[PDB]
Design a protein around this ligand. Structure first.
Ligand SMILES: [Zn+2]
Ligand SMILES: [Zn+2]
Length: 69
């Protein structure tokens, strides 16, 4: 529910980053696309990635044999 916690911020750890739409996290998870991941070791979006596989089977970043089946 809505506890109502008032903290300071969020650890500098980091936030997902998609080179396809070069957009942050909130945006992606803003009722548009789902945050997906790959084996190669990169982060992408549901649409972005799903679309890449159609165009360039290999990762649009490392371009390494990638397949989830
Ligand atoms: Zn994306
Ligand atoms: Zn990759």
């Amino acid at each position: 529910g809505s506890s109502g916690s008032s903290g300071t911020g969020l650890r500098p750890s980091g936030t997902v980053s998609c080179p396809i739409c070069m957009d942050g996290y909130s945006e992606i998870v803003q009722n548009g696309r789902l945050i997906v991941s790959t084996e190669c070791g990169h982060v992408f979006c549901s649409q972005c990635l799903r679309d890449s596989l159609k165009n360039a089977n290999t990762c649009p970043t490392c371009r390494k044999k990638i397949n989830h089946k």
